[PDB]
Design a protein around this ligand. Structure first.
Ligand SMILES: [Zn+2]
Ligand SMILES: [Zn+2]
Lengths: 96, 167, 144, 209, 116, 128, 179, 40, 119
DNA sequence: AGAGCGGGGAGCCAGCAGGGAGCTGG
RNA sequence: GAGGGAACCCACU
DNA sequence: CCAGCTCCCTGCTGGCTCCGAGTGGGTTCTGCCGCTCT
């Protein structure tokens, strides 16, 4: 009870110490959202500006704006990611 | 209201006292000493110049600043060579206007009953605690600061100091 | 005794298959072997790899820079992919492999670790207008 | 201690000769898998006493296609390396008309000695290796995929197939640990074979810059 | 054991350790004035790296008057037999490795402090 | 309470919780009443002794436990039992406190002068 | 001995002696009050070329500007020395782990400037400005002239429009220093 | 082990940090050294 | 979030007071000044701070705090908004009269009983 | 007199002092 | 059938 | 014999640039009061 274990439910209602400790807990989540938005947005911007001109060319290679080869095939298999599915290899796991 | 009343009653006079007297030499010597403040009730002067008791709704509607004139008593002493000190008592010298917090001690709504507030077109449920500056209601948000005159010892991280005491 | 950069070493025996020694038996099944593995609080990867009875194959760091300086650019590409996958899939979240592979290939295409920062991106052979669009616009255009 | 230093010398020799076999030099299967006991028998047990002496540990190998293309592996006794030891080694190389050598140093080399190496690099190719770096084979690590040094005809066929210039390929530094392992100079191309999560196998090409 | 500061008498400054080879012994000498004094203890400086096992001597008896401290009547005082005593954990930075309880007798004029 | 108590202990723990309930002890000797009076506070001892006067010459040593707790810098002089010393110093300290209150209220408000703002009612034309 | 009596209150405590040993060893080369004041004045805002000017500047810093709350008047240096020794003692207590470090977020270590203190800070600055302008006006009319009118000397616009500006905009300071 | 994950680790990855918050190794042992706790 | 806060309903921020009555009372309630004491008496005594100013030491801090609380509770020399803290472990008594201290009213409990009665 | 106008952190980089080999000179 | 900017504050997802 | 002096490694300190996206609404201030001259 002293160190923040709330033994009540939301139906039962919190004791005043439990109410204050629960407010201390929820303030952490509010702070985490508010201070994570800016760093996440900066990460997204830096990720975009590092790769924005990287693209699949007509010889099926992946090149940047300098026409340097990044990947010889996209994803090393040359396939778009919106049509591949989770499948199982039948011969990998079973014994001889 | 309590902070504004302490500021008006005690802090303005203390600030005037702690200001040093002005000693001026070219020669004749002039010593100016500001002695005693006087604060009036919030009055309005129009272009005619006749004072009027300025009401908070008048300040809000006419975009006036709800301020009270601040007078002060000044003493000017003259110290010549081969002459005694000369005293000039400039009593109640106007030195500016202090904006007045609503429903404080020096507001015109102080001590009024709810019927008197309704007759002045004021809401009796209105708390006061704000100023009228150019007809706009302004509240002073309280500001946190570290406490003064107290020794606080911290551990500065990634610095040349292992521990530091601060006052 | 010990290695200078390593402050603490945590022994543990892993109960999960993420850090076990998977082997192929004589019958031919994948068998998970619970073997004792160590963690460090500092990185001195080359000295640890050189040590006796330490696996010089599977032993790895989470430090990208020392993996690059010890094992090379393709190894740090694979390490970058593994660490990004760990960060993504901690939550159970799944991102398709080609996006991680493209990010790591972008960061390792020019022989060194090109950081996703102005000091990595704005030092490439890209045009001045792209660089000024990202960051340090006036400085980039004066350099141009 | 003599035992741990003998273990160090055996590990250095094993990694050196794995490197020489990986570089295409003729190193027989008998001396790849030389055990610690066989190293003790052939060389000695007490390096501080001097039964395995580092000067006696010098390895001379010849390349597979060209038997006259030989390379040395030298083991200086002193922890650092100065200009004098470099001059002695290159005099030995000149009197044995050999243009390639590896120098396995203990602590390092002086900056003047590295300057001498890069100055004499047009004539004699001399590679700096720390003993700490050579205590394991980094190409046997699971993070390091397979590197194959490409011949010039393979490079021209690659650039003709993908219609590329050399600067359009991915790069690898000449100071890269695998690049230093394979002893590749600027302008060469390394074919990297690695497993793929999506395709199974993927081949990358990296120009040395 | 610890070594303390020994002070000069002429200027009340600090005495620094020094040796005389003519007498071949140890002396604390003042180097502001010219005072010298033969040193009683040979120990010049001592580390106490793992000598933080004691915390009872830093505890004062006034904490018996603390109303926020926990009180017990199951740990009687050994020195005076009073039934009630406050108990608390150590308040040092050396208390990260120990939740050890210390007890102070709440009877006035006694102030006896002990452990478990 | 996982404790066994005999009749002495039962009566004195109940009475040690409600000292305030005692008006008149009847005829109990102090030697029996020794525990409940030691866990007590001097005003309650004054109440007990002024309802149960016959205990007075027995309880004086008890007052010492109070005196060295409230007047720890003091010692009795000769012809001073601890009860009369405690009452004399207690009333002397209360009288010193009352005199100090009547000083630092009179000599701080009424005696000296403090300066503050006064109302003007001037309506001066200095701001026209 | 006097410095350690001001710093260390129980001389039977050896670890405080051990930690004050390096400071005594560092500052042994200065042994006089005037040499120490010279050392202080050598690192001032503007070090004076005259040593006596440095003595005056160091004395002004140590009296007027060093711990104004314990004492600012003359011959109030023992209270300041006990307070500075208490600060050093608190630092040693934190160094020993014998006292816990202070908490910035602890809200008893915080004060709340309400309308009173904030308006007092404003009015202090602006009354200083009004006295400055009165001083300039009266200086001008005693330099070339002989007399000055006081009612024309006072600019009420200073106090009035400064309070009005700071309450209207919220920028708590001066109009030319809003940034 | 206090290994950092989430957004700070992603920042430590895409910004090639020479000073990671929680640098670490995963050391694997060879042979019998991996099988008993005493030689580990 | 977290930086802009609001007052609780019964929270009151102190307005400030002059330390002079408390200082005079401490001077003639057996507190000895710092100027008139040898440092050897500081080790066992309680340091007394008034608005953070070390003004003296006291040998009997418990009855001093009892007296100060009795004065504040009956609205004598000490006014109601003055804060008085006894750091018992550190042997200090800190008296704060300055403005900006946020406080709240609490019922006083003496011997597990409220002083608030039905009257 | 009165109208209009001049006067917080967090992490990169380079640039300096300190080191420590090593050629020329006696 | 369309003549200011700037600063600050509050708020929204 | 052995002292002398120059030029690349490391390390410390200072500068320098970055810090989510998009919406409403408000107020205030720009753009100032001494003039020298007729
Ligand atoms: Zn001396
Ligand atoms: Zn006891």
């Amino acid at each position: 009870e002293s160190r923040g274990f709330v033994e009540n439910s939301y139906l039962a209602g919190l004791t005043p110490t439990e109410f204050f400790f629960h407010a201390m807990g929820g303030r952490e989540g509010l702070i985490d959202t508010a201070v994570k938005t800016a760093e996440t947005g900066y990460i997204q911007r830096r990720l975009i500006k590092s790769m924005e001109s990287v693209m699949v060319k007509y010889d099926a290679t992946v090149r940047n704006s300098i026409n340097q080869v990044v990947q010889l095939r996209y994803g090393e298999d040359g396939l778009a990611g919106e049509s591949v599915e989770f499948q199982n290899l039948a011969t990998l796991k079973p014994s001889n | 209201l309590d902070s504004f009343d302490e500021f008006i009653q005690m802090s303005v006079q203390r600030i005037v006292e702690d200001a040093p007297p002005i000693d001026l030499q070219a020669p004749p010597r002039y010593l100016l000493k500001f002695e005693q403040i006087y604060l009036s009730k919030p009055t309005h002067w129009e272009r005619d110049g006749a004072p009027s008791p300025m009401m908070p709704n008048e300040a809000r509607l006419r975009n006036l600043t709800y301020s009270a004139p601040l007078y002060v008593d000044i003493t000017k002493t003259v110290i010549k060579e081969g002459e005694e000190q000369l005293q000039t008592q400039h009593q109640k010298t106007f030195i500016g206007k202090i904006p007045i917090m609503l429903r404080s001690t020096y507001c015109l709504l102080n001590g009024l009953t709810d019927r008197d507030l309704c007759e002045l077109n004021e809401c009796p449920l209105d708390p006061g605690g704000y100023f009228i500056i150019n007809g706009s209601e302004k509240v002073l948000i309280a500001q946190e600061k570290m406490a003064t005159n107290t020794v606080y010892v911290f551990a500065k991280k990634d610095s040349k100091y292992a521990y530091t005491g601060e006052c | 005794q010990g290695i200078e950069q390593i402050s603490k070493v945590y022994m543990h025996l892993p109960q999960t298959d993420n850090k076990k020694k998977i082997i192929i038996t004589e019958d031919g099944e994948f068998k998970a072997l619970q073997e004792w593995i160590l963690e460090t609080d500092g990185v001195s990867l080359m000295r640890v790899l050189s040590e006796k009875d330490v696996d010089p194959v599977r032993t790895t760091s989470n430090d990208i820079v020392e993996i690059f300086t010890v094992l090379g650019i393709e190894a740090v590409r694979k390490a970058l992919e593994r660490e990004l996958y760990h960060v993504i899939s901690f939550d159970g979240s799944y991102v398709n492999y080609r996006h991680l592979a493209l990010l790591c290939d972008t960061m390792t295409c020019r022989g060194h670790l090109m950081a996703i920062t102005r000091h990595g991106v704005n030092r490439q052979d890209t045009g001045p207008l792209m660089k000024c669009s990202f960051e340090e616009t006036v400085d980039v255009l004066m350099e141009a | 201690d003599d035992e741990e230093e003998t273990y160090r010398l055996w590990k250095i020799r094993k990694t050196i000769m794995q490197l020489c076999h990986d570089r295409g030099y003729l190193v027989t299967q008998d001396e790849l898998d030389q055990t610690l006991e066989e190293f003790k028998a052939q060389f000695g047990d007490k390096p501080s006493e001097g039964r395995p002496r580092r000067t006696d540990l010098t390895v001379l190998v010849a390349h597979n296609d060209d038997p006259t293309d030989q390379m040395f592996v030298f083991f200086p006794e002193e922890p650092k390396v100065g200009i004098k030891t470099i001059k002695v080694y290159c005099q030995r190389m000149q009197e044995e008309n050999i243009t390639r050598a590896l120098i396995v140093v203990q602590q390092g080399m002086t900056p003047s000695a590295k300057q001498s190496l890069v100055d004499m690099a047009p004539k004699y190719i001399l590679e700096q290796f720390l003993q700490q770096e050579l205590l394991i084979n980094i190409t046997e690590h699971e993070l390091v995929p397979e590197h194959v040094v490409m011949t010039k005809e393979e490079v021209t066929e690659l650039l003709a197939r993908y219609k590329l210039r050399e600067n359009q390929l991915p790069r690898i530094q000449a100071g890269d640990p695998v690049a230093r392992y394979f002893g590749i100079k600027r302008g060469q191309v390394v074919k990297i074979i690695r497993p793929s999560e999506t395709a199974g196998r993927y081949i990358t090409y990296r120009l040395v810059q | 054991g610890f070594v303390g500061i020994r002070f000069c008498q002429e200027c009340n400054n600090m005495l620094y350790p020094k040796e005389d080879k003519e007498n071949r012994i140890l002396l604390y000498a003042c180097r502001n004035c010219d005072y010298q004094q033969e040193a009683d203890n040979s120990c010049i400086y001592v580390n106490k790296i793992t000598h933080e096992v004691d915390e009872l001597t830093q505890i004062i008896a006034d904490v018996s008057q603390d109303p926020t401290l926990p009180r017990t009547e199951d740990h009687p005082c050994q020195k005076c037999g009073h039934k009630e005593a406050v108990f608390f954990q150590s308040h040092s930075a050396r208390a990260e490795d120990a939740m050890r309880l210390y007890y102070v007798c709440t009877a006035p004029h006694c102030g006896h402090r002990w452990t478990e | 309470l996982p404790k066994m108590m005999t009749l002495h202990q039962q009566c004195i723990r109940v009475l040690k919780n409600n000292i305030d309930s005692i008006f008149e002890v009847g005829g109990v000797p102090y030697s029996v009443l020794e525990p409940v009076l030691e866990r007590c506070t001097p005003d309650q001892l004054y109440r007990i002794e002024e309802y149960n006067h016959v205990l007075i010459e027995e309880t004086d040593q008890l007052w010492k436990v109070h005196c060295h707790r409230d007047f720890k810098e003091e010692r009795p002089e000769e012809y001073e039992s601890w009860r009369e010393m405690y009452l004399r110093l207690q009333d002397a300290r209360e009288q010193r406190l009352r005199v100090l209150t009547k000083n630092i209220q009179f000599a701080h408000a009424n005696k000296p002068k403090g300066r503050q703002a006064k109302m003007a009612f001037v309506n001066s034309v200095a701001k026209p | 001995r006097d410095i350690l009596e001001h710093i260390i209150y129980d001389f039977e405590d050896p670890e405080m002696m051990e930690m004050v040993k390096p400071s005594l060893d560092e500052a042994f080369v200065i042994q006089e009050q005037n040499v120490a004041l010279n050392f202080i004045g050598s690192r001032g805002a503007k070090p004076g070329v005259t040593k006596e000017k440095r003595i005056k500047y160091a004395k002004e810093v140590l009296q007027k500007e060093m711990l104004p709350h314990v004492g600012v008047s003359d011959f109030c240096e023992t209270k300041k020395a006990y307070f500075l020794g208490y600060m050093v003692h608190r630092l040693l207590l934190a160094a020993l782990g014998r006292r816990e470090l202070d908490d910035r977020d602890h809200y008893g270590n915080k004060r709340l400037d309400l309308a009173g203190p904030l308006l007092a800070f404003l009015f202090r600055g602006m009354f200083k400005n009004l006295l400055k302008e009165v001083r300039i006006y009266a200086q001008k009319f005693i330099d070339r002239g002989k007399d000055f009118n006081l009612e024309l000397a006072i600019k009420t616009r200073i106090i009035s429009d400064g309070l009005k500006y700071s309450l209207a905009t919220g920028n708590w300071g001066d109009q030319k220093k809003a940034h | 082990k206090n290994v950092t994950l989430g957004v700070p680790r992603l920042k430590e990855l895409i910004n090639i940090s020479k000073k990671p918050k929680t640098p670490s190794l995963t050391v694997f042992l060879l042979g019998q050294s991996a099988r008993d706790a005493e030689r580990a | 979030v977290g930086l802009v806060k609001n007052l609780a309903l019964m929270a009151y921020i102190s307005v400030g007071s002059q330390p002079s009555p408390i200082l005079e009372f401490l001077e003639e309630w057996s507190m000895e000044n710092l100027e008139e004491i040898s440092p050897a008496a500081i080790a066992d005594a309680t340091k007394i701070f008034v608005n953070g100013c070390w003004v003296g030491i006291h040998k009997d801090p418990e009855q001093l705090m009892n007296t100060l609380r009795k004065l504040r509770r009956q609205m004598d020399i000490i006014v109601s908004e003055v804060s008085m803290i006894r750091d018992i472990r550190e042997r200090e008594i800190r008296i704060y009269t300055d403005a900006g201290r946020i406080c709240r009213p609490l019922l006083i409990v003496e011997k597990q009983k409220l002083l608030l009665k039905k009257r």
